[PDB]
């Protein structure tokens, strides 16, 4: 009919869905598929088109209540079904990018190729907006901080990249590659998030 | 192979090259034997292994024989003035074992 | 200046990518001379992707696409270029075909030179592998 | 037992051996496996005195390609390799990972290696609604002169692929290939016992020597290379077995040597029927470069002197290799778990390139008057998408891009429109460098559109520079006079 | 119980039941112009050409009338089409298409064949323990077809018997004490290669088949195929290949093996017009 | 049946059989004749994102007949042995089909055995996602009832599986 | 008992005595030079260290090799190059 | 989004072993924090009673929370007193109680499980009893209570469901396949109720 390419677009969708579960390999959301958007969004304006061009050949033309009220009816029901899918896959899409923004707002701010420019423009804004909320009045905890709960206050870690030395709330921690600390695990959790410390 | 004449299957017997395994097999006359016969120690003379997939019995025996091989020019004289080629009747495939 | 601008190699689907040693730094390689019409084809063909259909719908066949093909009519984005053999061709990146340019009618606000990249229309004809061109812009 | 403990000048022996409950169906033929049992005695009444038949009862299988079927025909993949395969398809040099990783110790041949491992993966196998079925398997066919490692790359695809089987041309027999009828000693009834084809089914089959194969035992293979199932009508039975297996077979052109200087259709013996089916047609040759010889040469003693037990170890560790054990598994995930479909824009790229080969192919045929050894037909076209399939397979891709096109495509043209371009009037070629040597002087150069002006295919130039007289240069529009 | 499924569609019986819709829709498509055109068409839709040989298979699918003449004279009314032509010319998919649409279809192969194998082979019953004969791969097919592929490399002492079957389509048995007459009335549709490895339009078509004459002459129709090299034609097949080669069957996904477990038996036992 | 539920938008769009009760003109898009119309009491396949609306608004322009997955035979095979049926190649959304046919039908008897093959099979589909394999360094039986299960069962078995696995890890750590 | 390793060696040699062989087989020749003529020099020089009854080829072991391998080569050519060849070898025979 | 998936409406078992942390217990405590008659900080916690914490006296059991024994534990600065049903007697006892009303759960407390995990592996030298034998009781426990629940999610209906004396990590793992094939259940019912 008219919902075949959105059906395949929610398939891919799917396969997306399922791709990202996968445990926790933070897969890069596949590359927009535009050329699917760009048909079905031109299935959309030809639909729009011959709902036009029959509407006004209703008018001018003898035109019983039928024929006007039904093919127009089953038009509005394929935009909808058009439009279902294509607001499902830009919800998955939406919704990857929330658990990206929200689990790397620790971790880094990254290929961006692979969104188009209206979900680049929304990344970069919610980034902000949760900023906005770990500073409001959430100041005092760390909105943005790990969901396990904080078992063991005292861990001990082992640098996986060297990163030179770096200033802690009152000493100093001189990352040494392949050198093990034990320190609390509440001023390297940043660090463990990044990539930097390893153990525990 | 053989159908066994008391048990009625086939078997698999080796023959020169499997009785000479880990030894040496000595072919007089090599020029002279039949070129379907003479291709058959292709694969014994250089993988070293006799591979059989005949009547139902898939297997590779292992020969890991030393042919020395005692040949005659081609009219029974060597024409020292005529390259090696032109000497025998054998081919590069089996002169190069 | 020249020496100092920033590498955009377009990725071919969709994408402008950015690319940014010694003595002999500045020696290009030869995959660059291998790619610098390749780069320049793809982005006439982005610009064309982009102002004609949504302008003209006539789409852009490949040079490629044209061989089983016997009178159909076809529309080519290729670089005009003389052949080896001394005739006139255009070049795309998959493949070439000689043009009969007789007959022939060009948009007359453009100088047209070889290594120039063109938009012809025409038939193919199978009997001599050749696109018979009508108009070239 | 295993052929690489039997004594010396020993055949193999056998031991018969029982299983129970759930160590049944364990095991299918051929599949190697350590067996952990109770040597134990039965007193069979089927011939000396006092004798007892020995047996093992088995108390645990531990085999190395999984149960009947493949991981019996679905996936007992543990998470964990499941994910290390997953990790390991992301690598975006994992063709080269592939390809480096086949018969390590073979200097060279990378085009043989690729198409290698696209004969492991194997194509995508279709089952149309009308009911033919499109086979997606891939054979290989190794042409070329003595001593070019051929016979070892069949014997290391006889050891990495899942299902093997190594088979030599001479010593094998059509009914030992495909299926024996034999007649059962004690009821006297006429069954089946599998060849080399059903024992390797699900696999490949490598059949080394294969021009030395018997006429009528060649033929034998022809429709279980194609239509894959083997059909047989004898002793009262009639049955149509499965043998979806890939062929790597291994030859010789006539005379050893490839011998250029005769016709293309004169070194190769083979039919036209039975080269047609093989999809990449590989004629290798022994170049006899110095700068290469000498690599050859320092790889090959590398190779003796134990130092490659420590460089393909340290490669393999590196990260830069994958061993057989392990790619073992990988291509068994890949085959049960990836069947790649073409694109659209990877179809007409196909089309279009079938079409080219087969215009090609036309022009050879007419020049030289004769039909070509090495065929192109359907079968080919059919043979580029298989290996796109097994090119995208190999990444886990559902969908094969034209990136896998554009590679199948050079597979193809280096392997059988490289095997079919081998050329050996005389009249327009001599006037044609006579005239061109006393016209063109020795020093200057000349465009070629003059040339023509002055006229054909013209491979009286192509010649002409391959003795190094003239010398085109501009992109092809300037000959110019090298000097000879 | 036993309960006849057949016509390899897993579920259905060899002789189909007929519903009177069905019976109507047959007598409306019979009326069309070109009904002819149409059923052979739509025979291999995925074997493209070969038209011709279509409407052959299917005139030989509904044999002519057989006649049981007097005096002990029987003119055969099965059709048999021999098909000889150059390699990948789709001439075992056909008849792979007939093994699967006939309603009795029996494979055979010409080097996995003997003449015992195809006629009848004496051997030894084990319940009662008597001498017996079991029908072969060509007697099996009475009121069948027969799909002999590589038709030429049949050993001449096993091409007797297919001689004698396709001239009086009986076979008889003469050996181990047994003299009977088995019925082998089949329609027998071969395909051949050439002499070389491809038809050599030069020479007349005696040198290029390997078979005598005196077996062509039982073939009804012998239709020699050519793989002629062109251009148009070449991107046409390309195409159509390439069309059937992205075939997806319905509940699969894309880039997903299609794995078979023919598990159909949910219930055992019978639980104008233009297209 | 949420409106972005990937799993509900798959399984509205699923060809139903259903005759028309009107000559209908104008329409068949892409119903094999886009400009002419489609004629009366004409048995067609539409999506159920359409043959729902159809079926009800208007005598209704479409008759939606009882479709194969839902036939005696199946309604059969699933009170002979619920936990050894193929649901899969019967109906990759069986579960989700089945609720909104029952919905649109209000049919008291077909929900009163999906329910009962769902908790026949619900039993069978805990056993094996609390069966955790234990190296002393997957199944055979557990990977072939995988198999056949809808992306309803699908998706309960990766959840309790995930569940089960996490408390083992978190116990024996 | 005895199996010798080619551990202290000229691989140079070697790789130069192939090269040559290689070359002098292609033009003015037609004794096939493979891959398996320079395992062939390995496989020699290993029996000649058997013969000693040593458990390493020494570069003695391994120059007779070479010395058997060219003049097995030379003396199946024809006698017009016959002298070219074995002065083009003299350099790799040296001693000997 | 915000909340991963995993943790959409159930618990993971690292949030029950946080959960079951906060409970009190009683321990025996190796140093002194009680102030003489005759400086030193003092606990000042906010999310529990430091009073017991300011007032420890070597060898005087006290309660404090599990967290906080722990803590201690971690050092050689308390011994973590077993609670009285995690004595050999006291299993025995259960496990006959299992034994012998298979209908039933036996009266376990919520947290055994965790808590019997927390201490066998942080206290695993505090026990009156050869802790080989706590956990070979405890899994006996674990064995029974598993067998009667597998035999009532067979009595998964649509209307409500008992599950009483089920512990807090038996319930956590039970979770996401009750209460997702009683949705499910429940939609069927509502669907054919739809007159
Ligand atoms: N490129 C190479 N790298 C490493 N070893 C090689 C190479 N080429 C040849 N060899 C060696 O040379 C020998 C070649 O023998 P085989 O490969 O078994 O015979 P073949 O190459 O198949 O030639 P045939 O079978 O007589 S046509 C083996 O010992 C190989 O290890
Ligand atoms: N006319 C055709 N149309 C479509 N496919 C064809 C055609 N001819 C050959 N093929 C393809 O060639 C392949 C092999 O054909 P095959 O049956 O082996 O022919 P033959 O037995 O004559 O060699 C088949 O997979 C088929 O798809
Ligand atoms: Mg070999
Ligand atoms: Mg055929």
């Not at chain 1, 929610?10 to 390999?25: D, I, M, P």
Request: glycine share 4%; aromatic share 8%.
């Amino acid at each position: 009919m008219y919902g075949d390419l959105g059906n395949k677009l929610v398939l891919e969708a799917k396969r997306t869905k399922q791709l990202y579960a996968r445990s926790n390999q933070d897969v890069n959301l596949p590359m927009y598929h535009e050329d699917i958007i760009r048909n079905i969004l031109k299935e959309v304006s030809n639909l729009r088109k011959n709902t036009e061009y029959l509407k006004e050949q209703q008018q001018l033309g003898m035109l019983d209540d039928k024929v006007a009220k039904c093919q127009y009816f089953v038009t509005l029901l394929c935009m909808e079904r058009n439009k279902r899918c294509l607001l499902a896959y830009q919800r998955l899409r939406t919704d990857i990018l929330d658990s990206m923004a929200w689990n790397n707002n620790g971790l880094d701010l990254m290929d961006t190729n692979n969104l188009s420019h209206q979900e680049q423009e929304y990344l970069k804004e919610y980034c902000d907006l949760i900023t906005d909320l770990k500073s409001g009045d959430l100041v005092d905890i760390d909105l943005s901080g790990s969901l396990v709960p904080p078992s063991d206050v005292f861990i001990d870690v082992r640098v996986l990249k060297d990163a030179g030395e770096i200033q802690t709330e009152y000493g100093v921690f001189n990352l040494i590659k392949d050198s093990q600390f034990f320190v609390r695990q509440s001023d390297v959790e940043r660090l463990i998030q990044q990539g930097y410390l390893q153990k525990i | 192979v053989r159908k066994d004449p008391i048990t009625k299957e086939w078997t698999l017997e080796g023959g020169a090259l499997v009785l000479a395994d880990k030894g040496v097999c000595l072919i007089d006359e090599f020029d002279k034997m039949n070129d379907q016969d003479r291709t058959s120690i292709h694969e014994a003379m250089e993988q070293q292994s006799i591979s059989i997939s005949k009547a139902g019995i898939v297997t590779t025996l292992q020969a890991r024989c030393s042919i020395i091989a005692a040949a005659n020019p081609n009219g029974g004289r060597y024409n020292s003035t005529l390259p090696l080629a032109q000497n025998v009747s054998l081919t590069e495939p089996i002169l190069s074992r | 200046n020249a020496s100092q601008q920033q590498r955009f190699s377009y990725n071919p689907h969709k994408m402008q990518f950015i690319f940014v040693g010694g003595i002999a730094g500045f020696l290009p390689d030869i995959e660059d001379k291998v790619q610098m019409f390749l780069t320049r084809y793809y982005l006439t063909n982005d610009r064309v992707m982009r102002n004609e259909n949504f302008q003209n719908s006539m789409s852009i066949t490949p040079i490629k696409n044209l061989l089983g093909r016997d009178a159909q009519n076809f529309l080519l984005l290729g670089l005009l270029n003389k052949n080896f053999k001394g005739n006139w061709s255009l070049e795309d990146p998959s493949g070439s075909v000689e043009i009969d340019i007789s007959q022939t009618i060009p948009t007359q606000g453009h100088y047209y030179v070889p290594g120039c990249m063109v938009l012809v229309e025409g038939i193919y004809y199978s009997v001599g592998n050749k696109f018979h061109v009508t108009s070239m812009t | 037992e295993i052929p690489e403990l039997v004594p010396v000048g020993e055949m193999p022996r056998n031991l018969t051996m029982t299983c129970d409950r759930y160590l049944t169906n364990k095991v299918i033929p051929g599949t190697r496996v350590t067996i952990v049992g109770i040597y134990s005695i039965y007193n069979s009444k089927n011939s000396g005195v006092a004798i007892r038949t020995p047996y093992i009862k088995i108390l645990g299988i531990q085999s190395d390609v999984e149960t009947s079927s493949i991981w019996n025909s679905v996936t007992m993949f543990t998470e964990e390799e499941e994910e290390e395969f997953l990790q390991l398809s992301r690598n975006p040099k994992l063709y080269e990972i592939l390809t480096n990783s086949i018969a390590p110790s073979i200097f060279g041949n990378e085009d043989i290696k690729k198409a290698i491992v696209c004969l492991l993966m194997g194509g995508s196998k279709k089952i149309l609604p009308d009911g033919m079925r499109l086979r997606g398997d891939i054979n290989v066919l190794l042409l070329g002169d003595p001593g070019t490692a051929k016979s070892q790359l069949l014997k290391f695809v006889e050891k990495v692929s899942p299902i093997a089987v190594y088979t030599s041309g001479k010593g094998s027999s059509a009914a030992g290939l495909t299926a024996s009828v034999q007649r059962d000693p004690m009821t006297r009834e006429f069954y089946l016992e599998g060849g080399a084809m059903v024992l390797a089914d699900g696999g490949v089959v490598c059949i080394d020597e294969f021009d030395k194969m018997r006429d009528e035992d060649r033929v034998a293979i022809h429709e279980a290379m194609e239509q894959q199932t083997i059909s047989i009508a004898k002793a009262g039975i009639t049955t149509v077995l499965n043998s979806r297996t890939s062929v790597l077979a291994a030859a010789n052109p006539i005379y050893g040597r490839y011998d250029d200087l005769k016709s293309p259709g004169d070194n190769i013996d083979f039919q036209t029927t039975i080269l047609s089916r093989f999809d990449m047609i590989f004629i290798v040759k022994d170049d006899h470069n110095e700068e290469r010889d000498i690599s050859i040469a320092n790889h090959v003693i590398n190779i003796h002197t134990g130092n490659a037990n420590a460089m393909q170890n340290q490669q393999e560790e590196n990260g830069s290799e994958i061993s057989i054990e392990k790619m073992k598994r990988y291509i068994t995930y890949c085959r049960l778990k990836c069947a790649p479909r073409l694109s659209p824009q990877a179809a007409e790229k196909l089309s279009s390139n079938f079409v080219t080969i087969r215009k090609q192919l036309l022009i050879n045929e007419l020049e030289s008057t004769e039909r070509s050894s090495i065929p192109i037909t359907i079968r080919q076209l059919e043979a580029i998408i298989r290996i796109t399939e097994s090119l995208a397979k190999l990444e886990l891709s559902p969908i094969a891009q034209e990136r896998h096109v554009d590679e199948a495509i050079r597979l193809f043209q280096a392997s059988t429109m490289d095997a079919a371009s081998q050329d050996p009037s005389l009249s327009e070629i001599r006037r044609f460098e006579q005239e061109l040597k006393r016209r063109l002087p020795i020093g200057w150069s000349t465009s070629y559109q003059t040339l023509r002006r002055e006229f054909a295919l013209d491979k009286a130039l192509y010649a002409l520079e391959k003795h190094e007289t003239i010398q085109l240069r501009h992109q092809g529009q300037n000959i110019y006079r090298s000097g000879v | 119980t036993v309960y006849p499924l057949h016509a390899r569609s897993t579920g259905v019986a060899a002789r189909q039941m007929l519903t009177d819709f069905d019976i109507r829709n047959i007598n409306k498509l019979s009326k069309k112009k070109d009904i002819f055109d149409i059923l052979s068409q739509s025979l291999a839709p995925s074997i493209y050409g070969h038209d011709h040989i279509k409407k052959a298979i299917l005139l030989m699918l509904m044999g002519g009338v057989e006649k049981n003449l007097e005096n002990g004279s029987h003119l055969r009314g099965d059709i048999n089409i021999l098909m000889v032509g150059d390699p990948s010319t789709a001439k075992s998919q056909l008849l792979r298409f007939v093994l699967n649409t006939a309603s009795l279809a029996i494979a055979t192969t010409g080097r996995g064949s003997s003449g015992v194998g195809l006629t009848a082979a004496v051997t030894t019953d084990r319940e009662t323990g008597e001498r017996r004969l079991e029908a072969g791969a060509m007697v099996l097919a009475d009121r069948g077809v027969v799909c002999i592929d590589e038709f030429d490399k049949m050993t001449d002492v096993d091409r007797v018997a297919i001689h004698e079957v396709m001239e009086q389509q009986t076979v008889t048995i003469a050996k181990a004490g047994i003299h009977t007459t088995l019925n082998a009335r089949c329609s027998v549709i071969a395909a051949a290669n050439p002499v070389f490895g491809q038809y050599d339009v030069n020479r007349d078509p005696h040198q290029n088949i390997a078979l005598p004459d005196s077996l062509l002459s039982r073939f009804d129709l012998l239709f020699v195929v050519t793989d002629d090299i062109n251009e148009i034609r070449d991107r046409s097949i390309s195409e159509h290949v390439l069309r059937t080669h992205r075939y997806l069957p319905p509940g699969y996904l894309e880039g997903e093996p299609v794995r078979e477990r023919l598990n159909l038996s949910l219930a055992v036992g019978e639980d104008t017009e233009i297209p | 049946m949420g409106y972005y539920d990937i799993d509900d938008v798959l399984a509205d769009g699923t060809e139903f059989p259903c005759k028309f009760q009107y000559d209908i003109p104008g329409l068949g898009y892409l119903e094999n004749n886009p400009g002419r119309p489609i004629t009366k009491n004409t048995k067609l396949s539409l999506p159920l994102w359409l043959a729902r609306i159809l079926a009800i608004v208007g005598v209704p322009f479409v008759e939606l007949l009882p479709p194969d997955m839902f036939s005696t035979k199946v309604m059969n095979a699933i009170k002979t042995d619920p936990v050894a049926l193929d649901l899969h190649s019967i109906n990759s959304h069986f579960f989700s089909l089945a609720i909104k046919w029952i919905m649109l039908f209000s049919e008291k008897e077909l929900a009163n055995v999906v329910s009962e093959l769902l908790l026949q099979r619900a039993q069978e589909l805990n056993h094996h996602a609390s069966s955790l394999s234990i190296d002393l360094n997957t199944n055979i039986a557990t990977s072939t009832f995988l198999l056949k299960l809808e992306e309803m069962e699908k998706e309960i078995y990766k959840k309790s599986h995930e569940s089960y696995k996490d408390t083992k890890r978190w116990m024996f750590k | 008992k005895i199996y010798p390793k080619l551990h202290q060696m000229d691989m140079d040699k070697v790789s130069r005595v192939y090269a040559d062989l290689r070359r002098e087989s292609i033009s003015t020749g037609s004794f096939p030079i493979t891959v398996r003529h320079l395992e062939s020099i390995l496989r020699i020089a290993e029996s000649f260290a058997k013969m000693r009854l040593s458990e390493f080829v020494s570069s003695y072991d391994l120059d007779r090799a070479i010395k058997v391998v060219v003049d097995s080569f030379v003396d199946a050519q024809k006698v017009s190059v016959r002298r070219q060849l074995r002065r083009s070898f003299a350099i790799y025979t040296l001693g000997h | 989004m915000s909340l991963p998936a995993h943790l959409q409406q159930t618990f993971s078992p690292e949030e029950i072993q946080f959960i079951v942390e906060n409970e009190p217990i009683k321990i025996f405590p190796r140093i002194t924090t009680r102030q003489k008659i005759r400086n030193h900080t003092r606990w000042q916690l906010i999310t529990t009673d430091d009073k017991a914490l300011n007032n420890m006296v070597a060898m005087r059991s006290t309660e404090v929370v599990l967290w906080i024994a722990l803590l201690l534990k971690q050092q050689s600065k308390c011994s973590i007193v077993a609670p009285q049903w995690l004595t050999t007697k006291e299993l025995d006892r259960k496990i006959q109680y299992e034994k012998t009303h298979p209908d039933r759960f036996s009266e376990l407390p919520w947290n055994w499980l965790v808590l019997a995990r927390i201490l066998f592996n942080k206290a695993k030298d505090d026990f009156h009893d050869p802790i080989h034998e706590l956990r070979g009781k405890i899994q006996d426990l674990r064995e029974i209570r598993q067998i009667k629940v597998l035999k009532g999610l067979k009595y998964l209906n649509e209307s409500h469901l008992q599950l009483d004396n089920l512990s807090l990590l038996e319930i956590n793992e039970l979770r996401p396949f009750i209460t997702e094939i009683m949705d499910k259940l429940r939609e069927i019912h509502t669907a054919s109720l739809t007159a």
